[PDB]
Protein backbone atom coordinates (compact mmCIF):
# COMPACT_ATOMS: atom_id res chain seq x y z
CA UNK A 1 0.00 0.00 0.00
CA UNK A 2 2.74 2.61 0.68
CA UNK A 3 4.63 2.26 -2.61
CA UNK A 4 1.34 1.80 -4.45
CA UNK A 5 0.18 5.10 -2.93
CA UNK A 6 3.41 6.79 -4.03
CA UNK A 7 3.14 5.57 -7.63
CA UNK A 8 -0.59 6.35 -7.74
CA UNK A 9 0.23 9.87 -6.54
CA UNK A 10 2.77 10.23 -9.35
CA UNK A 11 0.17 9.06 -11.89
CA UNK A 12 -2.40 11.43 -10.38
CA UNK A 13 -0.01 14.37 -10.72
CA UNK A 14 0.73 13.50 -14.34
CA UNK A 15 -2.92 13.09 -15.31
CA UNK A 16 -3.88 16.30 -13.48
CA UNK A 17 -1.17 18.19 -15.37
CA UNK A 18 -2.47 16.75 -18.65
CA UNK A 19 -6.05 17.76 -17.82
CA UNK A 20 -4.97 21.28 -16.83
CA UNK A 21 -3.04 21.66 -20.09
CA UNK A 22 -6.05 20.48 -22.10
CA UNK A 23 -8.36 22.88 -20.25
CA UNK A 24 -6.04 25.86 -20.79
CA UNK A 25 -5.65 25.07 -24.49
CA UNK A 26 -9.43 24.77 -24.79
CA UNK A 27 -9.90 28.13 -23.06
CA UNK A 28 -7.49 29.87 -25.45
CA UNK A 29 -9.07 28.23 -28.50
CA UNK A 30 -12.52 29.18 -27.22
CA UNK A 31 -11.40 32.80 -26.87
CA UNK A 32 -10.15 32.73 -30.48
CA UNK A 33 -13.42 31.18 -31.68
CA UNK A 34 -15.41 33.75 -29.69
CA UNK A 35 -13.52 36.58 -31.39
CA UNK A 36 -14.20 34.99 -34.79
CA UNK A 37 -17.89 34.56 -33.93
CA UNK A 38 -18.18 38.18 -32.80
CA UNK A 39 -16.67 39.26 -36.11
CA UNK A 40 -19.12 36.98 -37.95
CA UNK A 41 -22.11 38.38 -36.05
CA UNK A 42 -21.02 41.96 -36.75
CA UNK A 43 -20.54 41.10 -40.44
CA UNK A 44 -23.99 39.50 -40.61
CA UNK A 45 -25.74 42.40 -38.88
CA UNK A 46 -23.93 45.04 -40.97
CA UNK A 47 -24.01 43.38 -44.39
CA UNK A 48 -27.01 41.02 -44.54
CA UNK A 49 -29.36 43.50 -42.85
CA UNK B 1 -2.59 8.83 24.17
CA UNK B 2 -2.90 5.04 23.97
CA UNK B 3 -0.17 2.88 25.50
CA UNK B 4 -0.53 -0.55 23.90
CA UNK B 5 2.30 -2.90 24.87
CA UNK B 6 3.32 -6.49 24.14
CA UNK B 7 6.28 -8.87 24.18
CA UNK B 8 7.67 -10.11 20.85
CA UNK B 9 10.87 -11.60 19.48
CA UNK B 10 13.72 -9.54 18.08
CA UNK B 11 13.23 -10.54 14.45
CA UNK B 12 9.65 -9.18 14.26
CA UNK B 13 10.45 -5.71 15.63
CA UNK B 14 10.43 -4.43 12.04
CA UNK B 15 6.90 -5.78 11.59
CA UNK B 16 5.69 -3.23 14.19
CA UNK B 17 5.59 -0.36 11.68
CA UNK B 18 3.07 1.17 9.25
CA UNK B 19 3.48 -0.40 5.83
CA UNK B 20 5.64 -3.36 6.80
CA UNK B 21 4.01 -6.76 6.38
CA UNK B 22 4.63 -10.19 7.83
CA UNK B 23 3.22 -12.93 10.01
CA UNK B 24 2.86 -10.98 13.26
CA UNK B 25 2.18 -7.76 11.32
CA UNK B 26 -1.14 -8.94 9.84
CA UNK B 27 -2.08 -11.63 12.39
CA UNK B 28 -1.24 -10.20 15.85
CA UNK B 29 -0.90 -6.40 15.72
CA UNK B 30 -1.68 -4.33 12.61
CA UNK B 31 -0.75 -0.66 12.79
CA UNK B 32 -2.66 1.92 10.71
CA UNK B 33 -1.07 2.94 7.43
CA UNK B 34 -0.99 6.57 8.60
CA UNK B 35 0.51 6.43 12.10
CA UNK B 36 1.33 9.31 14.45
CA UNK B 37 2.90 7.51 17.41
CA UNK B 38 6.22 6.09 18.57
CA UNK B 39 7.54 2.52 18.55
CA UNK B 40 9.85 1.60 21.44
CA UNK B 41 11.65 -1.74 21.70
CA UNK B 42 14.31 -2.97 24.11
CA UNK B 43 15.77 -6.33 25.08
CA UNK B 44 14.20 -7.65 28.29
CA UNK B 45 15.28 -11.29 28.39
CA UNK B 46 16.11 -11.33 32.11
CA UNK B 47 12.56 -10.34 33.11
CA UNK B 48 10.67 -13.26 31.51
CA UNK B 49 13.20 -16.06 30.94
CA UNK B 50 13.00 -19.09 33.24
UniProtKB/Swiss-Prot annotation, chain B:
It comes from Severe acute respiratory syndrome coronavirus 2. This is Spike protein S1. Binds to host ACE2. RBD also interacts with the N-linked glycan on 'Asn-90' of ACE2. Cleavage of S generates a polybasic C-terminal sequence on S1 that binds to host Neuropilin-1 (NRP1) and Neuropilin-2 (NRP2) receptors. Interacts with host integrin alpha-5/beta-1 (ITGA5:ITGB1) and with ACE2 in complex with integrin alpha-5/beta-1 (ITGA5:ITGB1). May interact via cytoplasmic c-terminus with M protein. May interact (via N-terminus) with host bilirubin and biliverdin, thereby preventing antibody binding to the SARS-CoV-2 spike NTD via an allosteric mechanism. Attaches the virion to the cell membrane by interacting with host receptor, initiating the infection. The major receptor is host ACE2. When S2/S2' has been cleaved, binding to the receptor triggers direct fusion at the cell membrane. When S2/S2' has not been cleaved, binding to the receptor results in internalization of the virus by endocytosis using host TFRC and GRM2 and leading to fusion of the virion membrane with the host endosomal membrane. Alternatively, may use NRP1/NRP2 and integrin as entry receptors. Changing residue 14 to S: In strain: Omicron/BA.2, Omicron/BA.2.12.1, Omicron/BA.2.75, Omicron/BA.4, Omicron/BA.5, Omicron/BQ.1.1, Omicron/XBB.1.5, Omicron/EG.5.1. The chain holds residues 395 to 444 of 1273 of the full protein. Changing residue 11 to N: In strain: Omicron/BA.2, Omicron/BA.2.12.1, Omicron/BA.2.75, Omicron/BA.4, Omicron/BA.5, Omicron/BQ.1.1, Omicron/XBB.1.5, Omicron/EG.5.1; complete loss of interaction with host integrins. Changing residue 23 to N: In strain: Beta/B.1.351, Omicron/BA.1, Omicron/BA.2, Omicron/BA.2.12.1, Omicron/BA.2.75, Omicron/BA.4, Omicron/BA.5, Omicron/BQ.1.1, Omicron/XBB.1.5, Omicron/EG.5.1; May enhance affinity to human ACE2 receptor. Residues 9-11 are annotated as: Integrin-binding motif.
Amino acid sequence: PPEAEVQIDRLITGRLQSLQTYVTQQLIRAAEIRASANLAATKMSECVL
Amino acid sequence: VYADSFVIRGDEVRQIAPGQTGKIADYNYKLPDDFTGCVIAWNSNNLDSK
